[PDB]
From Swiss-Prot, chains A, B, C, D:
It comes from the Eukaryota. Expressed in the retinal pigment epithelium (at protein level). CFH is one of the most abundant complement components in blood where the liver is the major source of CFH protein in vivo. in addition, CFH is secreted by additional cell types including monocytes, fibroblasts, or endothelial cells. Glycoprotein that plays an essential role in maintaining a well-balanced immune response by modulating complement activation. Acts as a soluble inhibitor of complement, where its binding to self markers such as glycan structures prevents complement activation and amplification on cell surfaces. Accelerates the decay of the complement alternative pathway (AP) C3 convertase C3bBb, thus preventing local formation of more C3b, the central player of the complement amplification loop. As a cofactor of the serine protease factor I, CFH also regulates proteolytic degradation of already-deposited C3b. The gene is CFH. Changing R104C: In CFHD and ARMD4; rare penetrant mutation that confers high risk of age-related macular degeneration. Sulfated on tyrosine residues. Changing W77L: In AHUS1; about 40% loss of C3b binding. Sushi 1-3 domain represents the minimal unit capable of cofactor activity. The property to discriminate self surfaces from non-self surfaces depends on the C-terminal region made of Sushis 19-20. Homodimer. Also forms homooligomers. Interacts with complement protein C3b; this interaction inhibits complement activation. Interacts with complement protein C3d. Interacts with CR3/ITGAM; this interaction mediates adhesion of neutrophils to pathogens leading to pathogen clearance. Interacts with complement factor I. Disulfide bonds join C3-C46, C32-C57, C61-C112, C95-C122. It comes from Homo sapiens (Human). Changing K82A: About 50% loss of C3b binding. It is linked to Basal laminar drusen: Drusen are extracellular deposits that accumulate below the retinal pigment epithelium on Bruch membrane. Basal laminar drusen refers to an early adult-onset drusen phenotype that shows a pattern of uniform small, slightly raised yellow subretinal nodules randomly scattered in the macula. In later stages, these drusen often become more numerous, with clustered groups of drusen scattered throughout the retina. In time these small basal laminar drusen may expand and ultimately lead to a serous pigment epithelial detachment of the macula that may result in vision loss. Complement factor H deficiency: A disorder that can manifest as several different phenotypes, including asymptomatic, recurrent bacterial infections, and renal failure. Laboratory features usually include decreased serum levels of factor H, complement component C3, and a decrease in other terminal complement components, indicating activation of the alternative complement pathway. It is associated with a number of renal diseases with variable clinical presentation and progression, including membranoproliferative glomerulonephritis and atypical hemolytic uremic syndrome. This is Complement factor H. It is found in: Secreted.
Amino acid sequence: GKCGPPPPIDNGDITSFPLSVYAPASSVEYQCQNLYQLEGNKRITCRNGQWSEPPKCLHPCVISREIMENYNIALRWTAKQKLYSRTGESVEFVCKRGYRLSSRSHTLRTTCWDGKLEYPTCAK
Amino acid sequence: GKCGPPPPIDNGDITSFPLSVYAPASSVEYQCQNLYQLEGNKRITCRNGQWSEPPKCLHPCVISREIMENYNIALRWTAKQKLYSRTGESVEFVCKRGYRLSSRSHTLRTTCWDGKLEYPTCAK
Amino acid sequence: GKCGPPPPIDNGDITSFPLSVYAPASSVEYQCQNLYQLEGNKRITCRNGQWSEPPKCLHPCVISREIMENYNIALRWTAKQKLYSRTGESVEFVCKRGYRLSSRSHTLRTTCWDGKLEYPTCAK
Amino acid sequence: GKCGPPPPIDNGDITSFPLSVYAPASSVEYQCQNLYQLEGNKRITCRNGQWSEPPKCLHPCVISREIMENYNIALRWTAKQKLYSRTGESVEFVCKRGYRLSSRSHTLRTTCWDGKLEYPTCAK
């Protein structure tokens, strides 16, 4: 029931030096890269010749200039610009001068989820 | 023709602090994480409101204990174990004691390509 | 009592995108790079215009070929080579063929502490 | 003249998986972490039982809110805030409203060098 070296995961790394073989019941742990959020259990364990399932590193969201221009919005806090937001973090927008929240628009405050921000839309 | 913040790529990072806006003709550069190999041009450039296409970070290959056991092979160089190999790096195997390269088998020396190693197979 | 951007630390990174200003009572967190061990509290907090003290990323230890050759020792577990060990992890050595632990020698099992391994010594 | 595993350096990493032994004439390469600038030759080579000297990862500079407040300056470009600057990158300041560059002051444009920014000073 020994295991080989643990699997790489995107945007994360194991916290220890990889070995060529691991005894059953051995474990290793992952950490996601800085702006990535680790989803699930960080620890994998060797049992019956296989590692358990690694966690996922959930993607940050990047602000889009073109979407913001198109939707007539700007970041609310010019001194606190979350150009990259972690999964679970919120970004707050405002309508640009001379615009108002459209009907059916998402709230001006919106949450990053694995790369995706649902942007609000303002109308003149 | 200004651009917003540059896009994240898997397993790589930009080498400078991201800005909220970039003038046309501005550029930034990526670096892949250690065992990843950067494919293409590391530099992206802002033109006509869009960034050019970022490079790709090609995946390393991890040795599989179960595949090696199944194919009756071992690493040749026990003092030089490439448990993780970069894209473009080769790994050399040997047949286990009492086995020989099978017909149609890949060569004992084999090259990592973006996560995939084509393993040789030995028969008793 | 607002704070500016949080301080860089060696071999670690903050887990969120840095902002130009932070309100009092704001906090950010650090993570150390993979084989580094974070000593202390990962969180810093902004109070009275200053950040609290960041943690330290304690160094891994690298095995020395020259010291091992000089002290007539080898790693015990040739399939489980901790070429780099985390702070707090132990490395186990053996005497080479035809040698014995010297008097006053450190134990064959020894612990990495912030870059330093105290190696055992064997005599013919 | 064989070498052991290559040495860790602060804020950088080798680009290949470390091996337990290296033949003379072998080489490995370092990369610095994103906002660090690699000074010198990235490649180390094994000769006569020793690795050659690794490069240095030169530190980025972080803007100080307290120094800026004390010197009556602000960043010039509020849409292009280099909160962290690479070694060799310049940061441009302006005097705050109702102040002028002091005599003997450093230029408003100033260059980051391994963590240190020489800030300009303005007087009322």
